[PDB]
Each structure stands twice: as C-alpha cells, then as structure tokens.
C-alpha cells in the first residue's frame, strides 16, 4: 500500500531551426488520471490555429482560430478569421470576422480591432542591467468595432436586453466584468495580475446590413498587468510577424472524460527560439499566464508526474547551461526526465513559475 499516487504522463518534443530562423516544431502529449475541475463533464475540444503571411510590405498576417468543443453533450464551436498587423511598434491593428455556434444557435461577427500595449516605464537601467527581464508592467487598450447581424430571435433579444441595461443601469461599465468572466475566469484574472478597467462604450446602434439588421458595438476596455501578463509583458514578441515567412499551424485538443485529461498538442510557429546575446540562443522563457492559470486546477490532486522533454537542435548547435541538466544526449537531441526535471514539471503543473532556461549556440 501507498499514498494516493495519481500518476500523470506527458512527453514534449521541440525541434528548432538554425541561423536567424526562430521556428520550432513543438509536439506535446499528456495524460493525467485525475478528475478535471470542470462543472460540466465530459469536455472535449479541438483547437486549430492557422497562420499565413498576407503581405510583408507593412505586416498583414492572416490568422485563423477554430475551436470545436463538446461539453456535456453541448456542441460548441467558434472560428475567428482575422487580419492582424503591427501598424506601429507600440500599436497593433486587426480586421477580422468569425462565428460562434452552440448547439443549434449560431451568430456571425465581423470586427475591426486595435490594441495599444503601453509599458509604464522604459528605463535603460533595467534593459542593460537585467539580461533576462521577465516581468514588465504595462497596459493594453482594446478598441473593437464588432458588427453582429441580428437574424435570430435570441440575437435580437440580446440586443435590446443589452441596450436596456446600458440605458437603465449606470453601473453596466463595470458590472459587465462579472458576466464577461464566466465562473473562475474572474478568479484567474487576479492570479495573473490582470486588472480589467471598466469598459467604455462609444455607442450601440443597428443599421440595415446586406441582408438584415446588424448590431454594431463600439467599445473600449483596458487591462493592466503586474508582470505575469504575457499578453502585456511580452507583447512585442508574442506576435512574430516580421520573422514569419511561411504558414504557421498549431493543432491542440484535450479529452476531459471526468476520469482524466488526455492532451494532444502540435505546433509550427516562429519565435520558439529567442536570442540571448553573443551568438547564444534560448528557448523562449516560459509564459507566466499559462502556468499561473493552470495552477488553479493542478493543485486538487497530488500526482507523481512522469515527464519527458525532447529538444532537437539544428546541425552544429550545442546546448549549454540547461537547468535542470539534460538527462541524456543522443548526438544532437537532448532529453529531460526524472530527478530535478520531473520536480520542475510538477512545480509548473501546480502553478509554479520556476526558471527552466535552455541556452544553445554553435
């Protein structure tokens, strides 16, 4: 006899590219024999990310995100075609359109959005003295022009309910955050240091569209981060459009059958390898928000994780200062398993944000 073991199995594979290229094939599978922290089970999801460079003249990229989900017999779907570009080093624009379908209900949307990510400070004493700055506080200002046709009965009902709420309730600007973070989303808001400012609305109106009424909503909101927020603190290089020359794809999914979680993650996208100076590169240091958010669900069952990381490097590139140390080296591919790496994997599955830096050069 022993304690509640609840083993968790997962493997991770990273294959990088040489030279100035920052691409990387990420491949991850996982299996946890623990009940997922979802109030509706079983859950399924099939996440598709597709990216293609539109025109490098100024930076258009065509990003497509398709989410298909099965949650307690409810078939959920949401697709987003979007044309994102960096109009300025500090300002990002996007013209997009998509649809969401739940069971039989489905409504299309088209949006013209602009996000401005401003860091509170630009002190040189931080840049030249901190070689690897993790936290960097800032604030993103969203400005969204979303147009939703109203061809269903519930679309119309939602529209007049919303306009009545705006006209009558004077607190709609901040009470929208309660509806707008379903369940534990608001709790995860604080975990990453995300503060949602009250939304400010330029107006709701409807006009005769191509085939019917179209609800057009101009609203702005801003969210500021204490340093964990990867959408803020790492804004510039979370969108590698300058170093994108060929189509990028990520295929993810999980099975949430109330007796375990089975995860399948693919990946082909630039930015995986980020330079560290002096010809030395590194895997991009881990995003803070995924770890901190998954800590909100990974601490309910104690588990003996059985992890396996497999990093594959291009010809000539040799790894140095991998902490924790790589278990083995088969010529050019290094492997992590057990010992300190398994402890780090458990640490980050329970929400920890410990540093695991992989540095490599030639």
């Amino acid at each position: 006899g022993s304690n509640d073991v609840t083993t968790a199995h997962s493997d991770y594979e990273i294959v990088l590219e040489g030279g100035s290229s920052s691409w990387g094939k990420v491949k991850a599978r996982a299996k946890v024999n623990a009940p997922p922290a979802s109030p509706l089970l079983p859950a399924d999801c099939d996440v598709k990310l597709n990216v293609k460079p539109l025109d490098p003249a100024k930076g258009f990229v065509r990003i497509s995100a398709v989410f298909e989900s099965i949650v307690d017999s409810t078939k959920n779907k949401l697709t987003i075609e979007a044309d994102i570009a960096n109009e300025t080093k500090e300002r990002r624009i996007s013209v997009g359109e998509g649809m969401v379908s739940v069971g039989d209900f489905s409504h299309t949307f088209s949006f013209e959005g602009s996000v401005v990510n401003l860091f509170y400070y630009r002190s040189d004493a931080v840049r030249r003295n901190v070689p690897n700055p993790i936290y960097m506080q800032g604030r993103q200002f969203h400005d969204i022009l979303m147009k939703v046709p109203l061809d269903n009965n519930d679309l119309i009902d939602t529209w007049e309910g919303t306009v009545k709420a705006i006209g009558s309730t004077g607190a709609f600007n901040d009470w929208i955050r309660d509806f707008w973070f379903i369940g534990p989303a608001f709790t995860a808001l604080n975990e990453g240091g995300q503060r949602i400012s009250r939304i400010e609305v330029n107006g709701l109106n409807t006009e005769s569209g191509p085939k019917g009424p179209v609800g057009v909503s101009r609203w702005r909101f801003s969210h500021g981060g204490s340093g964990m927020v990867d959408s803020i603190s790492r804004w510039a290089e979370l969108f590698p459009s300058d170093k994108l020359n060929r189509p990028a794809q990520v295929e993810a999914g999980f099975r949430s059958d109330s007796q375990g979680i089975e995860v399948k993650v693919d990946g082909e996208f630039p930015g995986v390898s980020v330079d560290a100076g002096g010809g030395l590169r590194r895997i991009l240091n881990h995003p803070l928000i995924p770890l901190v958010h998954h800590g909100m669900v990974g601490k309910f069952n104690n588990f003996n994780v059985d992890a396996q990381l497999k990093v594959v490097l291009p010809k000539g590139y040799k790894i140095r200062y991998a902490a924790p140390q790589y278990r083995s080296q088969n010529l050019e591919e290094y492997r992590w398993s057990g010992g300190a790496y398994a402890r780090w994997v458990e640490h980050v599955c329970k929400g920890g944000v410990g540093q695991f830096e992989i540095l490599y050069a030639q």
Binding site: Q308, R327, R335, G339
Partner: protein, 61 residues
C-alpha cells in the same frame, strides 16, 4: 532432473538433497524479494536508483 532432489533411499543422500532444496528455497526468497520490490517500484512509476540517485525513464531507457 536438475539434481536438486534425489530418488535416494539413504538418509545421507537426502541430507544433501534437503540442503540443496533449502538453499534453492532461500535463493528463491531473495530473488522474489528483489522482484516484488521491482514490481512495487514499477507499479508506482518511481524508477529511481536508490544508490546513485538517478532516475529511469520507462518510455526511453
């Protein structure tokens, strides 16, 4: 057939036969203890060598 026991009617030969049987039983106890230890140690997914302190990856070793 392996010579550990004998079809001998004399007590002195059965002395050696019983000694061989007892020794093989003790060896079986030792190997079974080691093997049950290994079965438990695989059953808990903690294949770490207790002396040198390394681990062992079931999926690649």
């Amino acid at each position: 057939s392996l010579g550990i026991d004998t079809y001998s009617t004399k007590t002195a030969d059965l002395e050696a036969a019983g000694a061989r049987l007892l020794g093989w039983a003790a060896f079986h106890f030792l190997v079974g203890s080691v093997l049950i230890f290994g079965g438990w140690r695989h059953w808990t997914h903690n294949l770490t060598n207790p002396f040198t302190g390394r681990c062992g990856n079931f999926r690649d070793f």
